[PDB]
């Protein structure tokens, strides 16, 4: 249609880099010199708690077209790396660095189990990337941010989850996730092949010792 | 219309929730035997290469005997 | 758009049966984890009993003995 | 490259006036934001449908798409007694849920 | 000309046809279902692939608890021994017997004659072989006693993949036997639970007593080498693998007891082309590809109907502009009837290339006192510059 909003998705990815005003001030706005004080709480209201967090994470997680490269397999990736790349820093971002009390709704595991499934497609574009190169810059870090970001994503469901404690019944809602979480022949795959790199096998042994500790703590 | 393609749609996801929690238990439990087999011979060859510092003479050698070769079920058909 | 809908609605089937092959598969892997429990559990069993024939045939050195008897008296050799 | 923070800062660089280092840092700061931010001079210039749109063609289209309809409106010498309504469905849309109405039990 | 902009009924028409929001909340009820099948295609894609990784494994290789590929096969160690003082005689034999329904003089039964690889009774008379009979009839002379280690291959054909491992192996891993993939996988899953990785590099892996001993003749228990995980992985291929299955018994044919024809067990069973038939790893790329075809059969009637879906929203926006234009008569004739004029003349003064004024309006002497101030700033421009 039309590469428009590739162009938000640095806009974002830029200006989240400044601790000070950028990020400040994107703080007050998202989780929460004297008439702009009326003209913010109006403004904030006008737009229909926390539908403008969720809404800036939900078009973050488009323009990244899961379906459209895992549809059809390296000309796409690597005509859309910068949009994935740039798209998937400002979410960790907005995850790491924003999302830590007065939510009443738990955002991390409503983007977990929307019935899309983003985080099978972040998985399986993480062995997709892992199949080309090994068998075109960016992709290296793309892999680690996929992997990172699965990982922060489960974390803070979890402490979302001890922070609420409204839902007990969310070890099986989040272990029953079809293709999240890969297996240990893969990883075992992952340990020996030399062509893979240290950081990518260390993160997902991370989040593989991460699915150990959900099935312990499930019963 | 919509509601049947809303009932089959709740019942393929319920179905395959409960094949991915299925499947990651068969995981779970697989690597545990596995990591139970390899504790309970480390530590048996361990405390027998210890304990071996007659009589004696015999029962250790019936002990690395039986160690030397372990042993699976009969598992076949049934003739009669 | 319903002809469209009902099209799909009728393909559904095989997804459907995709569904029934892989619980045969994972009934298979359930008969695999119990029969190789089953071959675990009396290997361990004969070996622990063999070592206790062996700890009642045996008799810095007697506390060595003894703590390897409180370790195989009851089956912690595990750990 | 990919050079520095330090380098878009306003003192290594020049201003409207009236070392080495600084003139080596804007060798590759002016290397690398010239081939970041040169526009695309080939085709793929369409961006949408929005810009292509021809105001000639529509209007051309809008002018027929008028006068023919009011031809249809005042010349048509029918009487309005005489205009004969049309089918609210068509011969398979009526068979449809023909069809869907008799399997509407199961 | 794929238009992303007129796949959208927005507000005109859905607030007159009410229909078009349980159209509109179809297409997107829609949008969800194939989405559901996308979901589902990388699943068949991941589990298939799951599968064939896996295929060596023996998750998927000893439990065949439909028809396991396996035949019992009992053998009696037989001795005849008479005509001495109670010339010794050693009639010794292996009798085969099939464990089923079947009988001993039964014909072309599945023996030890007919299908075994090798039986080599390594006696201690003379040593004899088996190259690839109702029964193994042997009887040499001698007076005193002789002892036979009755050794048994199996039917060790390259497709049971099950091979035993060193003595040393299976004191560590729990396994007598398996495949190739349990022994790379095993010490593998042994290394972790243990902190035997190291790094500088993730290939270095600490060595360990139990580990020195997996290669004694290398001379690796004089020095504790921290070494890479590939020395490692290129031992265990043939320094422990494949031994071809033996089976052993020690007995020796004895002077004065009678016979063992009908008193003796053992215990050695085998057919072998069913269950690497009807495996997952092929039946579900057969199902996969099955879909397939299913999927590119339902594709251009789905096509087809896109056609006539695009061509009837063309026809629903063509009588919806004239709708428009015979209602907006029809509320006020007069002042639509004024619009309709004055939009069809200035309509064709575009299309011809004209511009300008409008020429009936700027003849008369009120636009120039109506327009008293942009006059008095463009004749000191004109005049200033020198162009009146």
Same mark, same amino acid.
């Given at each position: 249609?039309?590469?428009?909003?590739?162009?938000?998705?640095?806009?974002?990815?830029?200006?989240?880099?400044?601790?000070?005003?950028?990020?400040?001030? $994107?703080?007050?706005?998202?989780?929460?010199?004297?008439?702009?004080?009326?003209?913010?709480?109006?403004?904030?209201?006008?737009?229909?708690?926390?539908?403008?967090?969720?809404?800036?994470?939900? $078009?973050?997680?488009? !323009?990244?077209?899961?379906?459209?490269?895992?549809?059809?397999?390296?000309?796409?990736?690597?005509?859309?790396?910068?949009?994935?790349?740039?798209?998937?820093?400002?979410?960790?971002?907005?995850?790491?660095?924003?999302?830590?009390?007065?939510?009443?709704?738990?955002?991390?595991?409503?983007?977990?189990?929307?019935?899309?499934?983003?985080?099978? #497609?972040?998985? %399986?574009?993480?062995?997709?990337?892992?199949?080309?190169?090994?068998?075109?810059?960016?992709?290296?870090?793309?892999?680690?941010?996929?992997?990172?970001?699965?990982?922060?994503?489960?974390?803070?469901?979890?402490?979302?989850?001890?922070?609420?404690?409204?839902?007990?019944?969310?070890?099986?809602?989040?272990?029953?996730?079809?293709?999240?979480?890969?297996?240990?022949?893969?990883?075992?795959?992952?340990?020996?092949?030399?062509?893979?790199?240290?950081?990518?096998?260390?993160?997902?042994?991370?989040?593989?010792?991460?699915?150990?500790?959900?099935?312990?703590?499930?019963? | 219309?919509?509601?049947?393609?809303?009932?089959?749609?709740?019942?393929?996801?319920?179905?395959?929730?409960?094949?991915?929690?299925?499947?990651?238990?068969?995981?779970?439990?697989?690597?545990?035997?596995?990591?139970?087999?390899?504790?309970?011979?480390?530590?048996?060859?361990?405390?027998?290469?210890?304990?071996? %510092?007659?009589?004696?003479?015999?029962?250790?050698?019936?002990?690395?005997?039986?160690?030397?070769?372990?042993?699976?079920?009969?598992?076949?058909?049934?003739?009669? | 758009?319903?002809? %469209?809908?009902?099209?799909?609605?009728?393909?559904?089937?095989?997804?459907?049966?995709?569904?029934?092959?892989?619980?045969?598969?994972?009934?298979?892997?359930?008969?695999?984890?119990?029969?190789?429990?089953?071959?675990?559990?009396?290997?361990?069993?004969?070996?622990?009993?063999?070592?206790?024939?062996?700890?009642?045939?045996?008799?810095?050195?007697?506390?060595?003995?003894?703590?390897?008897?409180?370790?195989?008296?009851?089956?912690?050799?595990?750990? | 490259?990919?050079?520095?923070?330090?380098?878009?800062?306003?003192?290594?660089?020049?201003?409207?006036?009236?070392?080495? !280092?600084?003139?080596?840092?804007?060798?590759?700061?002016?290397?690398?934001?010239?081939?970041?931010?040169?526009?695309?001079?080939?085709?793929?210039?369409?961006?949408?449908?929005?810009?292509?749109?021809?105001?000639?063609?529509?209007?051309?289209?809008?002018?027929?798409?008028?006068?023919?309809?009011?031809?249809?409106?005042?010349?048509?010498?029918?009487?309005?007694?005489?205009?004969?309504?049309?089918?609210? $469905?068509?011969?398979?849309?009526?068979?449809?849920?023909?069809?869907?109405?008799?399997?509407?039990?199961? | 000309?794929?238009?992303?902009?007129?796949?959208?009924?927005?507000?005109?028409?859905?607030?007159?046809?009410?229909?078009?929001?349980?159209?509109?909340?179809?297409?997107?009820?829609?949008?969800?279902?194939?989405?559901?099948?996308?979901?589902?295609?990388?699943?068949?894609?991941?589990?298939?692939?799951?599968?064939?990784?896996?295929?060596?494994?023996?998750?998927?290789?000893?439990?065949?608890?439909?028809?396991?590929?396996?035949?019992?096969?009992?053998?009696?160690?037989?001795?005849?021994?008479?005509?001495?003082?109670?010339?010794?005689?050693?009639?010794?034999?292996?009798?085969?017997?099939?464990?089923?329904?079947?009988?001993?003089?039964?014909? !072309?039964?599945?023996?030890?004659?007919?299908?075994?690889?090798?039986?080599?009774?390594?006696?201690?008379?003379?040593?004899?072989?088996?190259?690839? $009979?109702?029964?193994?009839?042997?009887?040499?002379? #001698?007076?005193?006693?002789?002892?036979?280690?009755?050794?048994?291959?199996?039917?060790?054909?390259?497709?049971?993949?099950?091979?035993?491992?060193?003595?040393?192996?299976?004191?560590?891993?729990?396994?007598?036997?398996?495949?190739?993939?349990?022994?790379?996988?095993?010490?593998?899953?042994?290394?972790?639970?243990?902190?035997?990785?190291?790094?500088?590099?993730?290939?270095?892996?600490?060595?360990?007593?139990?580990?020195?001993?997996?290669?004694?003749?290398?001379?690796?228990?004089?020095?504790?080498?921290?070494?890479?995980?590939?020395?490692?992985?290129?031992?265990?291929?043939?320094?422990?693998?494949?031994?071809?299955?033996?089976?052993?018994?020690?007995?020796?044919?004895?002077?004065?007891?009678?016979?063992?024809? #009908?008193?003796?067990?053992?215990?050695?069973?085998?057919?072998?082309?069913?269950?690497?038939?009807?495996?997952?790893?092929?039946?579900?790329?057969?199902?996969?590809?099955?879909?397939?075809?299913?999927?590119?059969?339902? %594709?251009?009637?789905?096509?087809?109907?896109?056609?006539?879906?695009?061509?009837?929203?063309?026809?629903?926006?063509?009588?919806?502009?004239?709708?428009?234009?015979?209602?907006?008569?029809?509320?006020?004739?007069?002042?639509?009837?004024?619009?309709?004029?004055?939009?069809?003349?200035?309509?064709?003064?575009?299309?011809?290339?004209?511009? #300008?004024?409008?020429?009936?309006?700027?003849?008369?002497?009120?636009?120039?006192?109506?327009?008293?101030?942009?006059?008095?700033?463009?004749?000191?421009?004109?005049?200033?510059?020198?162009?009146?």
């Amino acid at each position: 249609w039309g590469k428009y909003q590739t162009f938000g998705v640095d806009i974002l990815a830029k200006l989240f880099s400044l601790e000070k005003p950028n990020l400040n001030y $994107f703080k007050s706005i998202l989780l929460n010199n004297h008439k702009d004080k009326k003209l913010l709480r109006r403004l904030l209201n006008l737009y229909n708690r926390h539908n403008l967090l969720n809404d800036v994470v939900s $078009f973050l997680f488009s !323009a990244i077209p899961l379906q459209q490269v895992l549809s059809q397999p390296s000309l796409l990736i690597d005509q859309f790396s910068p949009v994935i790349s740039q798209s998937l820093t400002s979410i960790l971002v907005i995850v790491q660095k924003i999302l830590p009390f007065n939510f009443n709704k738990n955002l991390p595991f409503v983007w977990l189990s929307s019935e899309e499934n983003i985080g099978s #497609g972040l998985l %399986k574009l993480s062995e997709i990337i892992l199949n080309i190169n090994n068998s075109k810059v960016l992709l290296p870090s793309i892999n680690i941010s996929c992997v990172q970001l699965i990982k922060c994503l489960v974390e803070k469901s979890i402490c979302f989850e001890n922070c609420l404690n409204n839902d007990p019944e969310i070890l099986k809602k989040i272990a029953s996730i079809p293709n999240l979480f890969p297996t240990d022949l893969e990883i075992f795959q992952l340990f020996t092949n030399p062509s893979v790199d240290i950081q990518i096998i260390n993160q997902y042994q991370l989040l593989y010792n991460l699915k150990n500790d959900i099935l312990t703590n499930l019963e | 219309q919509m509601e049947k393609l809303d009932a089959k749609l709740n019942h393929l996801k319920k179905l395959e929730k409960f094949m991915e929690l299925e499947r990651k238990t068969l995981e779970r439990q697989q690597e545990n035997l596995l990591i139970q087999r390899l504790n309970f011979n480390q530590n048996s060859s361990k405390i027998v290469n210890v304990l071996s %510092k007659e009589e004696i003479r015999s029962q250790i050698d019936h002990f690395k005997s039986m160690l030397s070769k372990p042993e699976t079920l009969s598992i076949g058909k049934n003739p009669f | 758009q319903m002809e %469209k809908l009902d099209a799909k609605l009728n393909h559904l089937k095989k997804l459907e049966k995709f569904m029934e092959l892989e619980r045969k598969t994972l009934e298979r892997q359930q008969e695999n984890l119990l029969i190789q429990r089953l071959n675990f559990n009396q290997n361990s069993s004969k070996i622990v009993n063999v070592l206790s024939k062996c700890l009642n045939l045996i008799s810095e050195i007697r506390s060595q003995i003894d703590h390897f008897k409180s370790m195989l008296s009851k089956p912690e050799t595990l750990s | 490259n990919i050079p520095s923070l330090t380098s878009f800062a306003e003192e290594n660089n020049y201003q409207y006036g009236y070392t080495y !280092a600084q003139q080596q840092l804007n060798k590759q700061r002016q290397d690398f934001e010239r081939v970041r931010l040169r526009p695309e001079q080939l085709s793929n210039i369409i961006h949408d449908e929005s810009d292509t749109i021809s105001f000639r063609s529509n209007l051309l289209k809008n002018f027929i798409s008028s006068n023919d309809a009011f031809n249809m409106l005042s010349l048509t010498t029918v009487p309005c007694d005489r205009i004969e309504k049309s089918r609210l $469905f068509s011969e398979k849309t009526i068979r449809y849920l023909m069809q869907k109405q008799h399997e509407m039990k199961t | 000309h794929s238009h992303p902009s007129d796949m959208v009924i927005p507000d005109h028409l859905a607030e007159l046809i009410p229909e078009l929001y349980s159209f509109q909340q179809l297409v997107d009820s829609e949008k969800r279902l194939d989405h559901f099948i996308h979901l589902r295609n990388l699943h068949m894609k991941r589990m298939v692939a799951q599968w064939e990784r896996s295929k060596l494994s023996q998750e998927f290789l000893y439990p065949h608890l439909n028809f396991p590929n396996v035949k019992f096969l009992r053998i009696f160690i037989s001795n005849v021994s008479e005509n001495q003082p109670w010339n010794a005689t050693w009639t010794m034999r292996i009798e085969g017997r099939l464990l089923d329904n079947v009988q001993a003089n039964d014909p !072309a039964r599945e023996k030890f004659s007919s299908f075994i690889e090798s039986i080599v009774v390594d006696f201690k008379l003379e040593s004899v072989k088996w190259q690839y $009979f109702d029964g193994l009839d042997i009887k040499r002379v #001698g007076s005193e006693n002789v002892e036979c280690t009755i050794s048994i291959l199996r039917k060790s054909s390259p497709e049971e993949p099950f091979m035993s491992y060193s003595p040393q192996l299976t004191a560590i891993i729990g396994l007598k036997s398996g495949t190739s993939h349990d022994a790379i996988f095993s010490i593998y899953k042994y290394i972790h639970l243990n902190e035997l990785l190291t790094n500088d590099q993730v290939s270095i892996v600490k060595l360990d007593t139990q580990l020195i001993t997996l290669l004694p003749s290398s001379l690796k228990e004089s020095s504790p080498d921290t070494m890479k995980l590939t020395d490692l992985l290129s031992l265990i291929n043939s320094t422990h693998l494949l031994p071809l299955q033996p089976i052993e018994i020690d007995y020796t044919v004895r002077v004065d007891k009678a016979s063992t024809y #009908g008193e003796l067990v053992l215990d050695i069973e085998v057919a072998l082309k069913f269950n690497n038939t009807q495996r997952e790893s092929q039946i579900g790329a057969a199902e996969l590809n099955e879909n397939a075809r299913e999927l590119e059969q339902i %594709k251009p009637k789905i096509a087809l109907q896109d056609k006539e879906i695009t061509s009837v929203l063309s026809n629903l926006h063509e009588s919806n502009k004239r709708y428009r234009f015979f209602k907006k008569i029809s509320e006020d004739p007069v002042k639509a009837l004024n619009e309709c004029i004055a939009s069809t003349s200035n309509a064709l003064k575009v299309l011809s290339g004209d511009e #300008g004024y409008n020429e009936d309006m700027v003849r008369r002497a009120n636009f120039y006192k109506e327009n008293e101030a942009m006059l008095r700033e463009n004749i000191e421009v004109i005049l200033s510059n020198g162009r009146m």
